[PDB]
């Protein structure tokens with residue numbers, strides 16, 4: 001089969017994980033998507049000439065059993081760590097996601113991309129400079145997106161695939 005990349009989208013409720021995923025997969029903006037639904041989605045794409053499958057888990061937070069969270073973190077090859085630019089707590093929550101994914105994978109080298117969503121809003125509490133400083137501390141890429149206009153969307157997912165390839169070649 002063609003290569004499949006298992007991507008996981010994490011971050012606080014309300015940041016735009018579902019909207020980002022649906023924009024990536026279906027090329028439309030979805031206004032209201034029940035915040036409690038967690039599902040996986042697939043798309044066949046071409047990234048830098050490679051025809052591959054993206055298999056994306058749109059997470060929704062606590063699970064019935066914490067074992068289920070540990071399971072999808074071990075399964076997942078790369079993580080989009082999403083905050084919203086107008087929600088400071090969602091940015092502070094990134095430190096928790098960064099640590100928990102490393103912890104469950106028992107790894108210091110986990111492909112990740114920091115995503116600041118909702119860039120289309122003028123309302124902003126997290127300045128690009130402060131998100132860049134966080135991503136520099138982690139040594140990972142940072143991309144500002146808008147699931148509403150689709151700006152940055154393919155970059156965020158495709159950049160995570162590229163990070164996974166750099167991990168796999170070691």
Ligand SMILES: Nc1nc2c(ncn2[C@@H]2O[C@H](COP(=O)(O)OP(=O)(O)O)[C@@H](O)[C@H]2O)c(=O)[nH]1
Nearest residue numbers: 013014015016017018019031035118146147148
């Ligand atoms: N303006 C704007 N609103 C967005 C964007 N992404 C998501 N939203 C809205 O933010 C709310 C939460 O989005 P949702 O995808 O359900 O977030 P999730 O809980 O992380 O899955 C919804 O009302 C979305 O329409 C964006 O890029 N720009």
Ligand SMILES: c1ccc2c(Cc3nc4cnccc4[nH]3)c[nH]c2c1
Nearest residue numbers: 006007038040055056057072075076
């Ligand atoms: C990354 C990590 C796990 C999965 C899976 C397995 C899976 N894990 C799940 C947890 N909750 C709801 C649905 C779920 N499906 C499918 N695509 C993935 C991408």
Ligand SMILES: [Mg+2]
Nearest residue numbers: 017018034035
């Ligand atoms: Mg959601």
